[PDB]
């Protein structure tokens, strides 16, 4: 499930890498905390590149 996401913001372009995630049960009450909580989000997502305007 390792993949790269391109996020476009007013300040600049950001490139991020995703390590692992529970894909099938993502839209469920308990697994949704993985993306909501900042600490759990840092566990699975990293910032590999940032290019400001």
């Amino acid at each position: 499930v390792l993949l790269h996401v391109l996020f476009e913001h007013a300040v600049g372009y950001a490139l991020l890498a995703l390590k692992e995630v529970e894909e099938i049960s993502l839209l469920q009450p308990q697994v949704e905390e993985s993306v909501l909580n900042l600490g759990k989000f840092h566990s699975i997502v990293r910032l590999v590149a940032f290019c400001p305007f």
Binding site: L47, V48, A49, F50, C51, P52
Partner: protein, 567 residues
């Protein structure tokens, strides 16, 4: 909590027990190391984290590594490096990685990580660090240079440094610093190839690969200073003089109508018989300037020539001045010369005891700029040096031309001259006219000099009359009351009532913010023979309430030092 810290201490245990095997460290030393390691570990595993704890952890491990390194040489034991040193270095790398992940924006932490990787870590670990740095800090050209610098001077890979530079220009297309260092780097590569041939292709060895950088950088950045700058590095390399020759010729052909290029050619020509030869070179540099004037008649070109005359005069002296006086006249008729450079020549002429050209500069400045008050001050200083009897007419002509009423240095300067070579009554008349013309904050210095004159021209009685008249003109300074207090002190009477009366007026105006004035008042009651020391209780009480803010704290500290002998 302590489970992670316990894991880390049990991970640290094997190298400590190996060190105890070595004989490098004693058992009590191992106990102390364990205690301090646990104490430092507890700080960085908390829910609230600070950077200084990570810094202290890193510093402690570095100090331990240095101590081990020093002791191993004395013992002579070089075995088991991997068991201890590599484990400590790996732990420090983990700490640095966590700290850099937590605080990405701190460049100083990144540079400290780079330094530690250089000193203690494998070159591939340092290679990974630069990629992490440039990924999120690509907007700083200096970081690109540092990465490219390490590849060339340390890793000896010219290929890696070239790609780092080429990619850097794509992020920063308009940075002149990136081009200059990239220009320098290729010339450094050429020297390594020349030294390569002597130990055992032709085009790069000629410096062609650096010349491609030259043409493109000039096209992108259309600037004379950047163009001249590339020549500066070019002259630094002894080989490929033709490259310097090609750059130098393109200076005049491509870059014209700008003063800087004509200046550089002039200075290039610059670089008892020897003094005659030195004098000969000056005219050739001087000669080039006129074609610069004839081709480019702009004002900015003219300052570059008069200034060039200035250092040679300040650096035989008669011949240098003969150049300056003629080119001053030539510029003056064309009226291109600006106000500031008139002063610089005239001030220069005064210092070397030559007093006639300075007058001509002074006259030319007043005619060209009548309204400028600085010029009228400049002219006045010349005739004071010359001692000519034209000072009186100078004040009449200056104030008539100066329609604005506020001319403070002129009003001051009229006072000292009138004291020197005019009657006493006229000096008082000038002062009274000055107080009428100047009404604002500039009147402060006028009043102080008026009171000082009264004591000198008259006696204490004259100062009293002037002080009484000026005691109500509210724009004041603390020097007004301090001067009057000193005058009472010098007189034989030393009436203490007048001393207190002057202090009360000063405290009324500036008592809210002046801590020194309150402290000076208190010392008068103690030290003066006619003073009453028992009043000091009330003065200290009054000082606290009137003083505001930090001034109140200053008075406490000053009084505390005064109670001791430090004063």
């Amino acid at each position: 909590m302590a489970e992670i810290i316990q894991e880390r201490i049990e991970d640290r245990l094997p190298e400590l027990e190996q060190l105890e095997r070595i004989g490098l460290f004693s058992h009590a030393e191992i106990k102390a190391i364990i205690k301090k390691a646990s104490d430092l570990e507890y700080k960085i595993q908390r829910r609230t984290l600070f950077k200084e704890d990570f810094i202290n952890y890193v510093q402690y491990e570095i100090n331990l590594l240095e101590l081990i390194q020093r002791r191993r040489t004395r013992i002579g034991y070089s075995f088991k490096k991997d068991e201890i040193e590599n484990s400590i270095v790996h732990r420090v790398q983990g700490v640095f990685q966590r700290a850099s992940a937590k605080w990405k924006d701190d460049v100083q932490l990144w540079l400290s990580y780079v330094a530690f990787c250089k000193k203690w870590a494998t070159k591939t670990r340092l290679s990974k660090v630069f990629s992490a740095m440039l990924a999120i800090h690509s907007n700083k050209p200096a970081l690109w240079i540092m990465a490219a610098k390490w590849e060339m001077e340390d890793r000896l890979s010219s290929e890696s440094a070239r790609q780092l530079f080429l990619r850097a220009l794509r992020f920063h297309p308009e940075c002149p610093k990136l081009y200059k260092e990239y220009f320098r780097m290729e010339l450094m590569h050429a020297e390594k190839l020349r030294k390569e041939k002597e130990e055992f292709s032709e085009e790069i060895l000629k410096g062609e690969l650096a010349w491609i950088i030259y043409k493109n950088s000039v096209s992108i950045i259309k600037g004379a200073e950047f163009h001249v700058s590339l020549l500066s590095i070019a002259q630094l390399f002894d080989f490929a003089k033709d490259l310097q020759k090609e750059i130098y010729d393109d200076l005049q052909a491509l870059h014209t109508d700008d003063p800087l290029t004509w200046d550089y050619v002039a200075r290039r020509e610059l670089e008892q018989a020897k003094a005659v030869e030195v004098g000969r070179k000056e005219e050739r540099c001087c000669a080039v300037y006129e074609e610069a004037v004839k081709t480019l008649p702009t004002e900015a070109m003219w300052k570059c020539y008069i200034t060039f005359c200035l250092e040679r005069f300040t650096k035989l002296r008669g011949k240098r001045l003969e150049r300056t006086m003629t080119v001053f006249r030539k510029a003056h008729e064309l009226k291109l010369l600006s106000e500031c450079q008139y002063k610089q020549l005239s001030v220069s002429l005064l210092c070397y005891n030559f007093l006639r050209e300075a007058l001509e500069v002074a006259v030319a400045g007043t005619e060209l700029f009548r309204d400028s008050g600085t010029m009228w001050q400049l002219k006045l200083q010349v005739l004071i040096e010359s001692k000519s009897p034209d000072i009186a007419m100078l004040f009449e002509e200056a104030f008539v031309h100066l329609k604005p009423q506020v001319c403070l240095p002129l009003w001051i300067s009229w006072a000292e001259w009138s004291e020197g070579a005019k009657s006493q009554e006229d000096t008082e008349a000038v002062f009274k006219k000055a107080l009428l013309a100047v009404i604002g904050a500039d009147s402060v210095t006028l009043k102080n000099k008026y009171l000082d004159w009264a004591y000198r021209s008259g006696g204490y009685k004259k100062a009293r009359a002037v002080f009484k008249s000026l005691q109500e003109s509210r724009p004041f300074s603390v020097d007004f009351f301090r001067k009057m207090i000193q005058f009472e002190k010098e007189q034989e009477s030393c009436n203490m009532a007048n001393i207190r009366e002057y202090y009360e007026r000063a405290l009324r105006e500036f008592g809210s913010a002046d801590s020194d004035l309150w402290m000076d008042y208190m010392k008068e009651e103690l030290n003066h023979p006619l003073g009453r020391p028992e009043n000091c209780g009330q003065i200290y009480w009054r000082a606290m309430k009137m003083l505001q803010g930090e001034s109140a704290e200053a008075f406490v500290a000053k009084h505390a030092m005064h109670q001791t002998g430090h004063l």
